[model samples]
Target: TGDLINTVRGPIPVSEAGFTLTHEHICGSSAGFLRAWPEFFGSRKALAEKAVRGLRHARAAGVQTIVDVSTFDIGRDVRLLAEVSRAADVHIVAATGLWFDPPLSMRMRSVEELTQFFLREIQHGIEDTGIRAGIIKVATTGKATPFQELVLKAAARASLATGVPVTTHTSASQRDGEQQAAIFESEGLSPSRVCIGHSDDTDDLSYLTGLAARGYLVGLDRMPYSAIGLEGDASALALFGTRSWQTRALLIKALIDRGYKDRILVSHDWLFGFSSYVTNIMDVMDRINPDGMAFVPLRVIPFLREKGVPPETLAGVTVANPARFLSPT
Candidate 1:
């Protein structure tokens, strides 16, 4: 089997995507951060250096590949992705799709238009660069927007047309991943081709179990320490709610017990670097996730084993499942 995935440099055998973190950002999490406070972060060169340093640290901890899930709106920069890959000796898989906030350039595009855009990026090249997007990243989070549905439908269509898989930013508290999985299935895409991300944000095992039952990969993606039992950040309340590393291990162990071990994909959803000058949640998150993307291999894996998730099962979640998901049939 010559199964392959489109990394930023080019396609590589999926077997090379060992210990892959299925969702993360190497750039700023959102472009809004830089736009609102350009002074807060440095130039692209500066941020790129930070990303390279962070990635090298992750590689030291046994991460070989990372799916950079930033779509256009989420401050995606292929230049940086490629540069970081070269500098850190890590395989970087870039994405094509829309985050929840579509820029004005694509804000009014019809589903058909959006689909072609995604198809072009996946099949041909993203921008002028010859780098193809490895995955389709779509988000159907927050308030219902008339155009958000347009983006999701377009992503579903593009995913069906191309062999690339779809990963998502879901409002797990609302079980939004469920509807996202349904929409992808409605487009005739198999649940196996879709990852219901941020599934660990909520404690409702029933919802997570249901998606896994349907064959969707469940992302235990976000960093558990974002909700570090600290307060003063309304934003943290919206995103993390309440989650703990201990509780996360319990959630993971139960999923393994229920025979859904292969259906789980674990990650920190951590950024390589971010504007460290921000208030409240930003400071809090930075303080907690000191290991950055290394949190899974360094922290979570040990915790999971301690919680009784078998060794091979955790290995499958971090390694085999990602390679399978990223390498389309």
Candidate 2:
């Protein structure tokens, strides 16, 4: 009952983390390139302003909090997260961990060392920003690469040692969530501490069922608008998962009918606020995913309602599930 969740502003009771979306990269400003050439992605001020605007719109839609899973590998900006949180009047839970790939230096480290690395952010704060991360994010696709394996074990231990929850990037198509769950279990980490992400990418009800059966939270967390296509190759194709939003609703309906309501979490996986990448990158993204942070409320829930999911049920899935899962075990 005393569990506290970290937000950009500070720690709040998990119950205060109301109406949360467990996954979202509200800003993707890869720090290096963004700092090196602020002109490239518009001024830092402009980028942060746009992020605050989008977040405010999401706040207007009744989103009280969002977990910014954009770690260092992609551009994780803690200062910007703070700015957006205050400006938009919403709580932002920042994450700590490697994303899909680790650099060579990280790849060379032992699992023991990697544990401290993640713990540094969890126990202390990130990169001297003094803003601590509330969640540990470890990612693996297809199969665990050597480094992926290392980070997974390290992340599991860090989570075990700290009681911070782990949200993962997984391929439901490859069914690698099983492998991730096994790795975490062998580390003696409870399945309840992990959320297997990108699960909506596949239409496999059985795969979703298995993960939920194992006591893992199913992250039906990728909801891009219907018209835009983000595929460039096989890797993107796999990461992009399913193209049909309706199919995703059906998947959720199946899981609900099977009686695993509380294990479900939803979000846009929406990588927002990258306006200055190129001429039309952000432009096209905005055109494609115009809903941005509000995609779930604007597009998804209505569809789920049509599919016979009660609004009250989805309210618990969107609001209570995140607070419960995010609480320290």
Candidate 3:
């Protein structure tokens, strides 16, 4: 019998998950920013509709599960996610950990206190919604900050206690996936239960393979396009024009060739709705990949196939690997 995992709609066996997008977002905002200007982020109803539309498109493209890694610090709304998941008829696994730039309330909390906070959300429910989080998300940038390391440690401890997987965000430019992995291991969590995300952002094979060798899953998740801000600042577009999807695909094939096929996860890391403070990056992304969530199924897979990546490996990356990684032991 397969173990059950929690989704916004409720629990389901891992076998039901197919073509899972291991990382993506429905809606997010900065907790700090939203407090001062909640209405500036656009209508909540509008955001929910956009998310439903995106998830429906993904569902039509054969996607069965989406891991929404948005955290409370970044305005994680389990209620909204549940609403969208029901509307789209897709499974969305919510997250329990904190994002990078946690509020002072979170920063000042002890590791045990943070652990309890996460465990509460994973076990009982987030707030009063009773929609439990299926995964723990921890993120870091540059050299992991002192508070960031604390967050990671708490996430690992929470995962160990709850038997949930830990997904992460990393500053791949700094090659910090290694540091994140090291912190998880030090906390006595199995590397197999952790996914070092955004591994595609770096072309350094050693950095990616090094993490995979330790049993940690590597996320080649950023996809081919960039989310450019409309204001011309283009800071969010850093990954755009700087890296090619061809480079990411080649690196993925290289890793699979070296026998790390089962330890990789692929996604677009696309955002449907973002904070109002940041320029509307989703608008630019929509203009580029009109298919939205379907872009992976309709474009990325075909591109990889043309590049000599076999169908079986693609299946492993898109279907089998995520099912295994997400299954609760």
Cα lDDT computed for each candidate against the true fold? 0.81, 0.82, 0.83
Best by TM-score: 3
For candidate 1, the lDDT comes to: 0.81
Cα deviation of 129 in candidate 1 (Å)? 0.4
Local accuracy of candidate 1 as per-residue lDDT tens digits, 98-169: 887677889979999999999998999998998999899988775447787778788888888887898888
Pairs with steric clashes in candidate 3: none
User: Of the candidates shown, which would achieve the greatest lDDT relative to the real structure?
Assistant: 3
Residue 171 deviation, candidate 3, in Å?
Answer: 0.6
Report the alpha-carbon TM-score of model 2 versus the true structure.
0.93
Candidate 3: tens digits of C-alpha lDDT, residues 1-329: 46888999999888888889998888667655544664564767777888888889989888989999888887887888899999999999999898875888898998889899999999999989988999999998878888888888999888888899999998887998888988888999999899989888888988888888889999888885553333364555653545666677677788888899889999988777767335766666677677878878887888879978899989989989988888874
Models sorted by lDDT, best on top = 3, 2, 1
Model 1 ranges off by over 4 Å: 29-39, 142-144, 275-282
Please report the TM-score between candidate 1 and the true structure: 0.92
Question: Model 1 clash tally?
Answer: 0
Which regions in candidate 2 have their CA more than 4 angstroms from the true location?
29-31, 225-242, 274-279
For residues 1-329, could you state the per-residue lDDT of candidate 2 as single tens digits? Answer: 57899888989999888889898986665546566777766677888788888888888888899999887776687887898799899899999888874667777899998899899988989888888889988888799988888888998999988888999998668998999998889899998899999888888888889889988999988767343265653433443443677767666777888999989999887765652244445665676667688878887788889878998898888988998889988
